Amino acid sequence: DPAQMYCREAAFYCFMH
Amino acid sequence: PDRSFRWKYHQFRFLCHSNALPSHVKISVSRQTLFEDSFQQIMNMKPYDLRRRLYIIMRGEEGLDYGGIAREWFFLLSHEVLNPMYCLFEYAGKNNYCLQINPASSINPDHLTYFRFIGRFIAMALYHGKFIDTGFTLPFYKRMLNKRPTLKDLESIDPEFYNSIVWIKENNLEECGLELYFIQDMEILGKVTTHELKEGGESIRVTEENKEEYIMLLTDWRFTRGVEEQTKAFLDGFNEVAPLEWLRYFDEKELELMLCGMQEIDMSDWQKSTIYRHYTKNSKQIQWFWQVVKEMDNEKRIRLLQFVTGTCRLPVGGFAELIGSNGPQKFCIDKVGKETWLPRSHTCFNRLDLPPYKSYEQLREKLLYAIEETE
Ligand SMILES: *CC(=O)Nc1ccc(NC(=O)C*)cc1
Ligand SMILES: [Zn+2]
């Protein structure tokens, strides 16, 4: 859902950069 | 290749940044007509223009910061392509388990253009660093990476067919009089056809000296049967926007993460929703198991989740709502095998075959290896 996507997106960016 | 996921990611980003175009393209959609507007506007663009800044316009709304409006458009369109009226996809198991291309998709006369569009869209997500939730399978990702689907992959999409091929592999078919030939049948839209698995397969009987080649070709045929043209249209649409060769070094699990984003794994929820077979929550190996999981960072935990369930995606309800190929199926750990074995999984059942190892150190070592190296 949108909440989970915000999390998936932000956690990915933080892991990478 | 053997380098970290983060390293491969930045190499891929450097390829994307090194090939970006300036200015922008506008994609204007209404929410009621999301798919149709997205499909017309994107397919009416030269594919390289989709590497420009994306200006997504929800007709009649706010604006402000584009990171969040980008994510909403990518997320919603990734669900909308699944809409059954389009006849593009179907599910191998019950309750939308295991997405795959519909072999009858040609009932939609535009379906090849629809698949090309989905290719462009998925490439756009990768190119622009945005995430989707369509639910493609790990073997679908293998195809994008020119990795051949394995025998073990079959167990994820089609448990019986896998068991059927395993049986042939492990047993002497001449002893049981099993009559097989290098041909297969397929019915799509009520029109049954015959594919030869190699030249003259029609007459070539399967023997003990033939078996390994038969298993291989049959495996290839199960993954490609009836969806060749759809799959090629997807791949050419992706490749038009982002060359598929830029996806080198990734394995299919990393590519899934690239497209889905990164799920934080709640160790509490995981443990509260795990069921056991022969084991109990107090068995030594189960306790060693959760201590290994606590010691894992989030990347390894995701890797394990993919190893056991076949995907990094958790349902919105968490580990309680986890689905298998025959209905709801909670994460399950089963005492199977010898300590000389590696842990093994059955993704269709969300099951980990954990052998009764004799030491935390042995279990930890084999578990970390299996997650990293096997499937
Ligand atoms: C829901 C959720 O957990 N979101 C979230 C946002 C940001 C990060 N970022 C970093 O850790 C740097 C993690 C999780
Ligand atoms: Zn699963």
Numbering used by the authors:
A (entry chain C): 1 to 17
B (entry chain A): 491 to 865
Could you share sentences copied from the article?
Here, we report a general and rapid method for discovering α-helically constrained (Helicon) polypeptides that cooperatively induce the interaction between two target proteins without relying on previously known binders or an intrinsic affinity between the proteins. We show that Helicons are capable of binding every major class of E3 ubiquitin ligases, which are of great biological and therapeutic interest but remain largely intractable to targeting by small molecules. In addition to possessing increased stability and membrane permeability, Helicons are capable of binding large, flat protein surfaces that are inaccessible to targeting by small molecules, and Helicons have been developed to target a range of PPI targets in cells and in vivo. Characterizing Helicon-E3 co-structures and mechanisms of action, we identified new binding sites for α-helices on the E3 surfaces, as well as potential probes of the disease-linked E3, WWP123,24, highlighting the generality of our approach against this therapeutically important target class.
First, we focused on the NEDD4-like E3 ligases, which make up approximately a third of the HECT family. These include WWP1 and WWP2, which each consist of four tandem WW domains and a catalytic HECT domain at the C-terminus that transfers ubiquitin from a bound E2 first to itself and subsequently to the target substrate. We next solved the crystal structures of five Helicons, four in complex with WWP2HECT representing all three groups of HECT-binding clusters, and one from Group 1 with WWP1HECT. These structures revealed three distinct Helicon binding sites on WWP2HECT. In all of the structures, we found that the HECT domains adopted similarly closed (inhibited) conformations.
